[PDB]
Design a protein around this ligand. Sequence first.
Ligand SMILES: *[C@@H]1O[C@H](CO)[C@@H](O)[C@H](O)[C@H]1NC(C)=O
Ligand SMILES: *[C@@H]1O[C@H](CO)[C@@H](O)[C@H](O)[C@H]1NC(C)=O
Ligand SMILES: *[C@@H]1O[C@H](CO)[C@@H](O)[C@H](O)[C@H]1NC(C)=O
Ligand SMILES: *[C@@H]1O[C@H](CO)[C@@H](O)[C@H](O)[C@H]1NC(C)=O
Ligand SMILES: *[C@@H]1O[C@H](CO)[C@@H](O)[C@H](O)[C@H]1NC(C)=O
Ligand SMILES: *[C@@H]1O[C@H](CO)[C@@H](O)[C@H](O)[C@H]1NC(C)=O
Ligand SMILES: *[C@@H]1O[C@H](CO)[C@@H](O)[C@H](O)[C@H]1NC(C)=O
Ligand SMILES: *[C@@H]1O[C@H](CO)[C@@H](O)[C@H](O)[C@H]1NC(C)=O
Ligand SMILES: *[C@@H]1O[C@H](CO)[C@@H](O)[C@H](O)[C@H]1NC(C)=O
Ligand SMILES: *[C@@H]1O[C@H](CO)[C@@H](O)[C@H](O)[C@H]1NC(C)=O
Lengths: 5, 185, 610
Amino acid sequence: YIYTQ
Amino acid sequence: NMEGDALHSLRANLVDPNNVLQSWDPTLVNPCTWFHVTCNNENSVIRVDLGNADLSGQLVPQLGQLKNLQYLELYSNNITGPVPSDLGNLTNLVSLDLYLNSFTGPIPDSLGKLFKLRFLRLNNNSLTGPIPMSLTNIMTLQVLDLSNNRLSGSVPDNGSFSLFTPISFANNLDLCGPVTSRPCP
Amino acid sequence: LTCNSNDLKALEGFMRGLESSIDGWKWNESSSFSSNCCDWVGISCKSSVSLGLDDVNESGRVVELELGRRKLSGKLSESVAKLDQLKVLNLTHNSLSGSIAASLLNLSNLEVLDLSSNDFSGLFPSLINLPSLRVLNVYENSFHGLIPASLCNNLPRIREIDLAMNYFDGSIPVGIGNCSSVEYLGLASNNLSGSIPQELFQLSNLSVLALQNNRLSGALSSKLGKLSNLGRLDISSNKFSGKIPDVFLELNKLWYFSAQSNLFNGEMPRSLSNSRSISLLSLRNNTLSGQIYLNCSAMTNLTSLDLASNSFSGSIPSNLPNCLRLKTINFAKIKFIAQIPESFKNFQSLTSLSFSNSSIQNISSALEILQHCQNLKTLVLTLNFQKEELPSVPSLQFKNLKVLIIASCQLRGTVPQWLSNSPSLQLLDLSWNQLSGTIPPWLGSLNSLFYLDLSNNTFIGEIPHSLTSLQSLVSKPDFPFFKKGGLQYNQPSSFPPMIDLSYNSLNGSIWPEFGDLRQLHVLNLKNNNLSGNIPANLSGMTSLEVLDLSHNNLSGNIPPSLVKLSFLSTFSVAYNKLSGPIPTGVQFQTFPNSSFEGNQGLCGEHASPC
Ligand SMILES: *[C@@H]1O[C@H](CO)[C@@H](O)[C@H](O)[C@H]1NC(C)=O
Ligand SMILES: *[C@@H]1O[C@H](CO)[C@@H](O)[C@H](O)[C@H]1NC(C)=O
Ligand SMILES: *[C@@H]1O[C@H](CO)[C@@H](O)[C@H](O)[C@H]1NC(C)=O
Ligand SMILES: *[C@@H]1O[C@H](CO)[C@@H](O)[C@H](O)[C@H]1NC(C)=O
Ligand SMILES: *[C@@H]1O[C@H](CO)[C@@H](O)[C@H](O)[C@H]1NC(C)=O
Ligand SMILES: *[C@@H]1O[C@H](CO)[C@@H](O)[C@H](O)[C@H]1NC(C)=O
Ligand SMILES: *[C@@H]1O[C@H](CO)[C@@H](O)[C@H](O)[C@H]1NC(C)=O
Ligand SMILES: *[C@@H]1O[C@H](CO)[C@@H](O)[C@H](O)[C@H]1NC(C)=O
Ligand SMILES: *[C@@H]1O[C@H](CO)[C@@H](O)[C@H](O)[C@H]1NC(C)=O
Ligand SMILES: *[C@@H]1O[C@H](CO)[C@@H](O)[C@H](O)[C@H]1NC(C)=O
């Protein structure tokens, strides 16, 4: 899955 | 990141009419997200698969800087020039496929420093000169195809070459030996 | 017009230092090119009389040597310093190695020295006398040890200094304050440590300052407000600490500020929340705490705001839609435990929003609010709304949405029809949810969609034929994404085109028509009920890097035509009903034995002989 941080 | 630099050095030296290298962006912290490159879990490049990519241009010594590289598949392209000696700095390589390209010059003696190499295919190039003896030192080597080059010299049946047959050395310039079709005078 | 003889002999020395010949120069002397260096390509001559040289001879003097991107290997010969009328030396983006002779830092006429992107190494020469020099660029080399302590003593006319991407170490030299005229200073990507010397803040024409990616430490002193012409400041990836000084009323030109990945703490200073200049603001991955506050009456330049991965508490600021230029928000990893305020219905400037892993709740109102932001392009909701229900309401519309990622929320429900109101979707990630039903054939009609992740759900039924027909798989400001260490993807085009249906209940066979998707880099069907034969026509997916069919019910033979996929690096048929000889093509021989495991009747190479 894709996430941002 | 230094590996990214190495492969980008390779990119600046190749010719890519189909944009297969378009995703290769030197500003990135590493090249694991670059297409055609695979990294291991520690994010170090273990594969480059560029086979049949319509690539032209030439290799670069910086290729030698990928310490964990395992499979280098460059085959079936138009790449020209020499096979860099620095390729011998890749200890973890099990497959080197340069076949069906335009390479010229001789075969680096450093290639005999790859002790894990299963597959060496240089066949169908313009390569010239002698067959490096260190290759006999590589006991892991399952496949060897040097055929269709301009190579000239002697080919012993000792060591790992005891494994191989005339089809591996066929259609060269002047080659002789017991592993070949022509015995030496 | 006619090459000076000494200049020619200096250029001849430079030429031997090289390991390869420059085209457009008469080189070997068997060369048929002009013997006059003035018609050599990359060399600019000026009259001796125009340079104020009154002597007996009238000759062309070499004032510019520009070799950028000529693929040069060798050393840089000392004799280049024999060219005393040299104004520009540009060697950028080459392979040159060795050290730099002190001789070359003695040229009195030199204006631009650009050595960037080479192999130059060893210590940078301590003696710099270059009274005419506008630009000094050593960016991207192998230099090490101290930045010269005397660096600016002889550079009265200097403008840009760029030392970035080297091995330079120690504290920034106290003498950096004698750079009085400098505008650009790059120090980034080095070994620099210690505090910033107070003397740096005396450089009153400083415009851009790049300090990122070093070991710089201590506080960031209030003396920063002394640099009033500063427009762009990158402090990222050091270890600074304490509060951020409240100077931002003094820096009235500052449009760019990036402090990310430091140890900063406390609340954001009042003045920064008031800056009329700041445009891009990245504070992410620090220890900043308290309630986020921005005066959007004051903040009329704000465009990119990035607070992700900080210690903030309290509420999502509801006044942000009053910042009229604000486009992107990365709020990821701030734990709000709240919902999105009603007022976000008015945010017309917003094109990109990330609440990823922010503990947001009530997804029903989240989507009902966010559909009214006309310009929304990228929406990342990952790791919120846990166990809630992905709205099936037909009414929702995100017209301009390029990217929708709501992943790992354990959402329940089906693939909703409202999603069809985003015909411009490039990228859809619903993976890692509780979503059920069948994958709707209308997904096939999305003409821009190149990345589809439905993986790790409960979906059942057949793969729709229409996927076989996706237009963008058949033929061909910043908002980083990370893919589950996580690798960073700078924009949507950075993701390999993908259909990942993995980890579901899908039954049925694999359609032959997949062979029509020539732009597909990854096909992941693993862990399903798929049965039937692997179609030979998969051979026609020319771009396919990754083909994963493992843990399915597939029977029959691995089609020999799969050898025609030459880009295929990673492949699994493991744990199927498969049978027969394993294809012997070159890519296949490099696949690990685990790729074929759990198939009894498979034989040939990688298995027991047939
Ligand atoms: C094979 O013979 C060649 C030629 O004399 C020699 O250089 C090489 O080291 C030998 N290899 C082995 C392993 O005996
Ligand atoms: C050096 O030349 C390159 C073109 O090869 C150019 O882009 C760059 O601006 C030059 N560097 C300087 C400092 O002018
Ligand atoms: C700054 O310039 C002054 C005057 O030229 C000089 O006294 C001082 O040494 C310079 N700074 C350093 C550390 O070289
Ligand atoms: C800074 O800018 C002004 C105008 O650009 C100029 O007069 C002055 O020389 C510069 N400052 C220094 C310290 O040289
Ligand atoms: C967050 O900041 C810390 C400390 O500076 C750094 O070590 C870490 O890598 C950062 N995390 C990310 C993902 O940037
Ligand atoms: C607003 O930001 C832009 C760059 O995005 C910059 O040109 C300008 O200086 C800023 N405006 C003010 C008032 O500083
Ligand atoms: C916010 O900005 C406006 C305009 O700059 C100012 O007049 C107002 O008093 C500010 N409010 C606060 C609380 O800072
Ligand atoms: C989400 O936040 C949790 C809890 O704070 C943290 O453990 C995890 O690293 C985060 N995951 C991602 C992908 O951001
Ligand atoms: C799938 O999802 C659950 C959470 O939804 C997670 O814990 C699990 O490890 C994931 N498994 C796979 C196969 O990705
Ligand atoms: C895979 O297995 C076969 C026999 O089952 C064996 O000959 C071959 O060496 C194996 N490949 C590797 C690299 O383990």
